[PDB]
Amino acid sequence: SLSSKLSVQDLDLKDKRVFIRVDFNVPLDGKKITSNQRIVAALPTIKYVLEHHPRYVVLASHLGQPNGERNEKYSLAPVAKELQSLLGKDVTFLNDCVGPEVEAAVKASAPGSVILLENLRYHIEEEGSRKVDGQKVKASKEDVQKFRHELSSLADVYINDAFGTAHRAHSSMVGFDLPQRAAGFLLEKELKYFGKALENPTRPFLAILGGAKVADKIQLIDNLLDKVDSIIIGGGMAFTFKKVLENTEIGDSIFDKAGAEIVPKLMEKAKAKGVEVVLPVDFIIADAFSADANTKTVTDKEGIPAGWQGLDNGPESRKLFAATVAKAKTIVWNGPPGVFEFEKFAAGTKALLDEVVKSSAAGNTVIIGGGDTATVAKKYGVTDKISHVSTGGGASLELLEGKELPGVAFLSEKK
């Protein structure tokens, strides 16, 4: 159970050597943080720990893709400075995550110190491999164990707060053999929500899916079909389901050739489980993929003329989706119903967004788990209205498509 794991909140931190794997993978531009969102998100854990007077707090993370080689372009130095400002406490920055220098520095620290180590991925043994000439140069089991040995040396307790990496069995996610591997407030939140949704869902459990390709979400639908009561399929995804199941004439809309092969299968299953599949009955077409393109509403039956392409949810579909949402007690949403980047094609997304929020207002569990689906919530400033906007990215998907997460499995049980 994603929900049975140990929390930071259960740990006895006093005078302990705490190690926290955090997600400080922020965007840099010329060695400067374009977005400090991730640093800000990590603060609660860091602050809660510090209040219990640990001997010291070692923070580690990765940034960009150094590729197991020391590359200045992906140094965590800037991050160290932003955190010091944001935290309002000094942060010692070490040029590495392992070695005598680190050991020394760490050992000479003052109580309550906050050490941030250099980019874990400067070492090939973190990921356990490296790309050289396109091929995957794997690291030797001995070196991998050495690295994990050195890393663990620095701590007495281990806290994971990097959900975004929990789906990889990297040295920092699964190499800490301590008696207590706990969850940080950040990752606990993801575990609590996705936990309920996938374990004891308050039916009806609905799932809104949308976006561009169906091919990337084949494993997602399949698994969810064993879970949900009804599922809505919107966006550029729906065009494949409609041309296949209903012979709908789609114009120059998104068609996933490979995904069309599976559509009958997922549908057979949907029926098998008695899952209610809601699809778009009408769309807003455009003569070109641009904010300045001529629109025109058409429907299921009228179809879409050649040249034209549907870029948003039509009026009837909005009524249809609004209804479905309004009947659910648990909602997990990933993917916008239309090309919301353009105001002309933003109606469907807005309509849906309002409904979901209203459902959250009702006191229903709404879980956003999409990149652009979170951006939508941020844009309309409703983020605080959604029960949970996940930050797991690839980990969130994998979790939803069935997979068991190494970083999560490795944690201790509540006790």
Residue type, 187: L
Bond from prior residue into 264 cis (ω within 30 degrees of 0): no
CA dist., res. 68 & res. 128, Å (int): 9
How deeply is 2 buried, as exposed, middle or buried, from its count of CB atoms within 10 A (0-12, 13-18, 19+)? buried
Which of 105, 10, 128, 1 lies closest to 58, judged by CA? 105
Say which CATH topology domain 193-401 has: Rossmann fold (3.40.50)
b/e 248-280 (16+ beta carbons within 10 angstroms → b): bbbbbbbbbeebbebbeebbeebeeeebebbbb
Number of neighbours of residue 385 by Cβ within 10 angstroms: 18
Q: How was this structure determined?
A: X-ray
Per-residue CA distances from 321 to 300, 347, 351 (Å):
15, 13, 9
CA dist., res. 384 & res. 398, Å (int): 25
Catalytic residues: 38, 213, 371, 394
> What resolution does the deposited structure have, in angstroms?
2.4
SS in 3 state form for the chain? Answer: CCCCECEHHHCCCCCCEEEEECCCCCCECCCCECCCHHHHHHHHHHHHHHCCCCCEEEEECCCCCCCCCCCHHHCCHHHHHHHHHHHCCCCEEECCCCCHHHHHHHHCCCCCEEEEECCHHHCHHHHCEEEECCEEEECCHHHHHHHHHHHHHCCCEEEECCHHHCCCCCHHHHCCCCCCEEECHHHHHHHHHHHHHHCCCCCCEEEEECCCCCHHHHHHHHHHCCCCCEEEECHHHHHHHHHHHCCCCCCCCCCCHHHHHHHHHHHHHHHHHCCEEECCCEEEEECCCCCCCCCCEEECCCCCCCCCEEEEECHHHHHHHHHHHCCCCEEEEECCCCCCCCHHHCHHHHHHHHHHHHHHHHCCEEEECCHHHHHHHHHCCCHHHCCEECCCCHHHHHHHCCCCCHHHHCCCECC
Enumerate residues preceding breaks in the chain (C to N > 2.5 Å): none
Q: Which CATH number fits domain 1-186: 1.20.1250.20, 3.90.1150.10, 3.30.479.30, 3.40.50.1260?
A: 3.40.50.1260
Return the CA Rg of the chain.
24
How deeply is 414 buried, as exposed, middle or buried, from its count of CB atoms within 10 A (0-12, 13-18, 19+)? middle
Which of 125, 129, 127, 60 lies closest to 96, judged by CA? 60
Per domain, the residue ranges of the chain are 1-186, 193-401
